[PDB]
Amino acid sequence: PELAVHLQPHGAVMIDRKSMFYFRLSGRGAQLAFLLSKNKNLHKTARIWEIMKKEEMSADQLKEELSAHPFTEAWTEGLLDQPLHVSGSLDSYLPISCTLQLTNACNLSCSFCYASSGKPYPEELSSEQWILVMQKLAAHGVADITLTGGEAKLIKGFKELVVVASSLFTNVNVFSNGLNWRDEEVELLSHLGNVSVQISIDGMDNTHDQLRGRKGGFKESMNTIKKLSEANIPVIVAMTINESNADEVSDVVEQCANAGAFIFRAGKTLSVGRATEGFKALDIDFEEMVQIQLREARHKWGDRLNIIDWETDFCTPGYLAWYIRADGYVTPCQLEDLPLGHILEDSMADIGSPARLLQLKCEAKNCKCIGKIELSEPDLPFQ
């Protein structure tokens, strides 16, 4: 693991930047973690605690205390032996993960698209501006970046941008419809080494092609999955479910397994953007139909492919993750246009205002997760 401690106004989190697992630290636990990362010795850390805190603590008591949870238990086995990166703020909520909508342009114009993509916004951040943004985010401790759109790789200067992303972040993911991939793009992402690709597949050939409005789209996108996987790029396949494709999940999973994909994830079509027109919620029969196929698929393909459960490493919207639109406005979530601020016009500290987050929590209509967030009781390191 590549561990970091990220400070927040109500407490700190420890993050494994590689897996993006994170763990809410108690104030005491954070202090002990920092000590162990420095002196690397349970006896030394316990004795320091005794001196500074005027409280008895032996190495056995410290070991037993940390053995109370499997993650803190690893701190007694040398997990904290590498330098622990420090980031964040006690005064504002700064993210550990961001999703950057590089452009709203797209070669498709899917009738369900939550982003209403196809045409770019009249003014979008240039690749040079996104490179400025990424330097600011990385210097603030953002560890994980997703590049989306639209079709992200349509942005002029994409190659330089994705190199900057790879260089400045622990993990990069590029979301793509899988169309119009060039050999040197595959090669570039392969060599960069920390870039994954998420490809949308919405059915077998004919259903996918109808839903996406592209005859031959499935075959091209599946070929892209194969080329990426052959170049050792982790591929995540995202299938967005509706009444047309609900019965095709198991067949799609097989195709993805054969193509070498790493992860398969199915999700509902949400009533956002172009999908609002004529929206019908997935009724219960179709939802159960998906679930039985996911279960069957794990029995069959679970060895060769991670098949995600239908509906922590979840970065809480707004508090731990930001979505940055192609026009520069920052929101808690790719589904939400209610802004925290503007990435060029406002300071990082102002964007992460706790008061605004509370306001967005009660006013957001499209991100369903943010309204459900319950902050833990304040428990800060060092008091």
Ligand X SMILES: C[S@@+](CC[C@H](N)C(=O)[O-])C[C@H]1O[C@@H](n2cnc3c(N)ncnc32)[C@H](O)[C@@H]1O
Q: Which residues are annotated as a binding site for [4Fe-4S] cluster?
A: 106, 110, 113, 362, 367, 369
Is residue 344 involved in binding its own copies (CB under 8 A)?
Answer: no
What is the amino acid identity at position 169? Answer: F
Is residue 181 involved in binding ligand X (CB under 6 A)?
Answer: no
Of the candidates 289, 218, 295, 292, which has an alpha carbon nearest to the alpha carbon of residue 256? 218
Is residue 176 involved in binding ligand X (CB under 6 A)?
Answer: yes
Is residue 117 involved in binding ligand SF4 (CB under 6 A)?
Answer: yes
Nearer to Mg ion, 96 or 275 (CB): 275
Q: What's the min distance (Å) between Cβ of 241 and ligand FES? A: 16
User: In this structure, are residues 221 and 209 in contact, taking their beta carbons and an 8 Å threshold?
Assistant: no
- The span from the first CA to the last CA of the chain, in angstroms, equals 28
Which one of ligand X, its own copies, Mg ion, none interacts with residue 10, CB within 5 to 8 A by kind?
A: none
Distance CA 159, CA 183 (A): 13
Residues 115, 147, 261, 330: which binds ligand X (CB under 6 A)?
115
Instruction: Tell me the number of residues near ligand X by CB under 6 A.
Output: 20
Q: What's the min distance (Å) between Cβ of 117 and ligand FES? A: 18
Cα 174 to Cα 136, 145, 234, 309: the distances in Å are 20, 9, 11, 22
Q: Which two tokens stand for residue 152?
A: 């992200």
User: In this structure, are residues 242 and 112 in contact, taking their beta carbons and an 8 Å threshold?
Assistant: yes
Nearer to ligand FES, 222 or 335 (CB): 335
Q: What's the min distance (Å) between Cβ of 368 and ligand FES? A: 5
Q: 321: which residues sit within 8 A by CB, 6+ positions away?
A: 95, 96, 97, 98, 99, 315, 332, 333
Which one of its own copies, Mg ion, ligand FES, none interacts with residue 383, CB within 5 to 8 A by kind?
A: its own copies
Q: Which two tokens stand for residue 251?
A: 């067949």
Is residue 367 involved in binding ligand FES (CB under 6 A)?
Answer: yes
Residues 49, 75, 114, 264: which binds ligand X (CB under 6 A)?
114
Residue with tokens 């501006």: 129
Is residue 231 involved in binding its own copies (CB under 8 A)?
Answer: no
Distance CA 115, CA 59 (A): 54
Q: 241: which residues sit within 8 A by CB, 6+ positions away?
A: 249, 266, 267, 268, 269, 282, 286, 290
User: In this structure, are residues 306 and 263 in contact, taking their beta carbons and an 8 Å threshold?
Assistant: yes
Is residue 160 involved in binding its own copies (CB under 8 A)?
Answer: yes
Cα 240 to Cα 69, 199, 246, 275: the distances in Å are 36, 11, 9, 12
Distance CA 30, CA 15 (A): 12
Is residue 170 involved in binding its own copies (CB under 8 A)?
Answer: yes
Is residue 320 involved in binding ligand FES (CB under 6 A)?
Answer: no
Is residue 149 involved in binding ligand SF4 (CB under 6 A)?
Answer: yes
Q: What's the min distance (Å) between Cβ of 110 and its own copies? A: 30
Please report, as ranges, the residues that interact with Mg ion according to CB under 5 A. Answer: 244
Please report, as ranges, the residues that interact with its own copies according to CB under 8 A. Answer: 2, 7, 17, 31, 34-35, 37-39, 44, 47-48, 51-52, 82-83, 85-90, 128, 131-132, 135-136, 138-139, 141, 159-160, 163-164, 166-168, 170, 184, 187-188, 191-194, 347, 349, 382-383
Please report, as ranges, the residues that interact with ligand X according to CB under 6 A. Answer: 106, 112-115, 148-149, 151, 175-177, 200, 238, 240, 267, 269-270, 272-273, 275
Please report, as ranges, the residues that interact with ligand FES according to CB under 6 A. Answer: 317, 333, 335, 367-369
